[PDB]
Amino acid sequence: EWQENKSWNAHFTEHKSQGVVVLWNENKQQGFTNNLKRANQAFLPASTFAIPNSLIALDLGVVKDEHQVFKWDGQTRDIATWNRDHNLITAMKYSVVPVYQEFARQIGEARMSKMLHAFDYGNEDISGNVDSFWLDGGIRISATEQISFLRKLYHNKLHVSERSQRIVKQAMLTEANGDYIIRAKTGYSTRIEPKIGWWVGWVELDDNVWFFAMNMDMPTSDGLGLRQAITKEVLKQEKIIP
Amino acid sequence: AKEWQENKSWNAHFTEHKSQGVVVLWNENKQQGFTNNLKRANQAFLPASTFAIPNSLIALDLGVVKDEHQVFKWDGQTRDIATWNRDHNLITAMKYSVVPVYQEFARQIGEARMSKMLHAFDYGNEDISGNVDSFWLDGGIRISATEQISFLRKLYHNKLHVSERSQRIVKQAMLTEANGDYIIRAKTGYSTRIEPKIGWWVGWVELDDNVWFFAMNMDMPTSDGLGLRQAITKEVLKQEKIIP
Ligand SMILES: *C(=O)[C@@H]([C@@H]1N=C(C(=O)O)[C@H](S[C@@H]2CN[C@H](CNS(N)(=O)=O)C2)[C@@H]1C)[C@@H](C)O
Ligand SMILES: *C(=O)[C@@H]([C@@H]1N=C(C(=O)O)[C@H](S[C@@H]2CN[C@H](CNS(N)(=O)=O)C2)[C@@H]1C)[C@@H](C)O
Ligand SMILES: [Cl-]
Ligand SMILES: [Cl-]
């Protein structure tokens, strides 16, 4: 079942914001959200598209492994961490769009369309060329749809190799300590309103996994740390992390 | 290949705690090694719970362990470490150093396959003499800090003669710490059945642009000092500007 817990709206309104958190308790097969409507509204994925793009690139051999180096093209872009050589791990850490656009061009439109359909990722009616559609609004996805996709990835159930799925889950590693492991991907959609932040992923515990997907209003880049901070406040409230 | 560099200033991090030991570092990009004590870096000890790394690789490659979700049920014997008295999988068995799970792996692998695969891994002295389910606690096997690094470099590069999948699963199980600055994959040990009683910590630090392998051991006359395995290692990594 799904349970709506409107008490989590306080974690957004404390920051003069609005958003949705969606949680899924894998052991109990139960979901929770503050806003069932916004949980099911589709937003541009922005940098969260790094997950399916990386899976497809690895499965087709566009990317050999997580050590392959994608050289900087020497064009200075306005995110400083993009202006250097990357591998699949650092490209995900720094959300390096130009690396992902070269992956997409090599995948090509036909194989990209077929794979996203196989993954049941995003809307049926995608539009835009293969290096741009995932930046310019040609694909969108909801927080509940991000959870369903991430559950398939966690269980190695996507229609790509087990190896591809294991490598991308390695690249998603964000935090680990003696209490929990978080595998996740941030996003920040700026090209089309509403400007939003994403954080999608899961928390591994000794005896359970909690999937999460959040998006929130992001009128300026000043608020970007709230993607992780508000999510962690909800996880702490629900006793998932200490 | 390149000369080991000795840095005796690291001894201060041991003597601060009235302790003695060795830290060995390997800079992968530069193919350069560093230690406070070249002699002790080459001294071979029982691996104790550091053996969980090769034991898990062999169990996965032979199909004794299907994957990292397979549950190893508690046998119902109450042991003195409370976290052992519960069901485990390959991830939690490594986190809690659950010897009874690893002893079941070793019995299913058996003496012959265990001896052959440690030979294939070039692991320490390759000697499994003793009980098939305790030789890494009180039998003949011995490995040095430098030998631990040689083994871990092969694992990092998927160069051991087991499947790539087996190597990726064990590296997942070794995950110890991750933040925006670094990832540590590592395994603790504490050898208490045979003198000298020692602590171990072996593994690597992944940075954006390099990997630093480490192997440390130290005298551990009482369980008091077990946190020094990680704390002394991190003081050295901080001194060398590897972590903040
Ligand atoms: C993905 O969604 C986009 C990228 N994701 C970004 C992110 O890191 O969240 C970056 S924005 C980057 C963050 N660090 C720089 C400075 N932040 S600050 N000090 O101004 O608050 C800017 C980028 C948008 C992808 C689609 O571009
Ligand atoms: C592996 O080498 C041995 C195991 N390694 C352990 C470890 O924690 O490093 C456990 S010892 C663990 C720590 N806390 C309990 C002991 N007392 S305390 N709270 O002071 O640390 C249990 C175990 C020895 C394996 C061969 O047994
Ligand atoms: Cl990992
Ligand atoms: Cl063990």
Residue numbers in the entry:
A (entry chain A): 24 to 265
B (entry chain B): 22 to 265
Wording from the paper:
Of the serine carbapenemases, the OXA family of carbapenem-hydrolyzing class D β-lactamases (CHDLs) represent a formidable treatment challenge. OXA-48 is referred to as the “phantom menace” or “hidden threat” as clinical isolates producing OXA-48 are often difficult to detect, missed by routine diagnostics, and the blaOXA-48 gene is localized to a plasmid that disseminates rapidly. The major active site residues in OXA-48 that contribute to β-lactam hydrolysis are the catalytic serine residue, S70 that forms a covalent/acyl bond with the substrates, and K73, which needs to be carbamylated in OXA-β-lactamases to aid in the deacylation reaction involving a water molecule. When comparing different carbapenems, OXA-48 most efficiently hydrolyzes imipenem with a kcat/Km value of 370 mM−1s−1, whereas hydrolysis of meropenem and ertapenem are appreciably less at 6 mM−1s−1 and 1 mM−1s−1, respectively and doripenem turnover is not detectable.
To probe the molecular basis for carbapenem selectivity, we determined the crystal structure of the K73A deacylation-deficient mutant of OXA-48 in complex with doripenem at 1.5 Å resolution. We obtained a 1.5 Å resolution data set of the OXA-48 K73A variant co-crystallized with doripenem with two OXA-48 molecules (molecule A and B) in the asymmetric unit. In molecule B, the cavity resulting from this mutation was occupied, in part, by a full occupied chloride ion; in molecule A, the W157 adopts a different conformation that is made possible by the K73A cavity-introducing mutation. There is a covalent (acyl) bond between doripenem and S70. The β-lactam carbonyl oxygen occupies the nearby oxyanion hole comprised of backbone nitrogen atoms of S70 and Y211. One of the oxygens of the carboxylate moiety of doripenem is interacting with the side chain of R250 thus forming a salt bridge. The methyl moiety attached to the C1 position of the core pyrroline ring is making van der Waals interactions with the CD2 atoms of Y211 (3.8 Å distance for both doripenem molecules). The hydroxyethyl moiety is in the same orientation in both doripenem molecules; this moiety is not making direct hydrogen bonds with the protein but is making van der Waals interactions with residues Y105, V120, and L158.
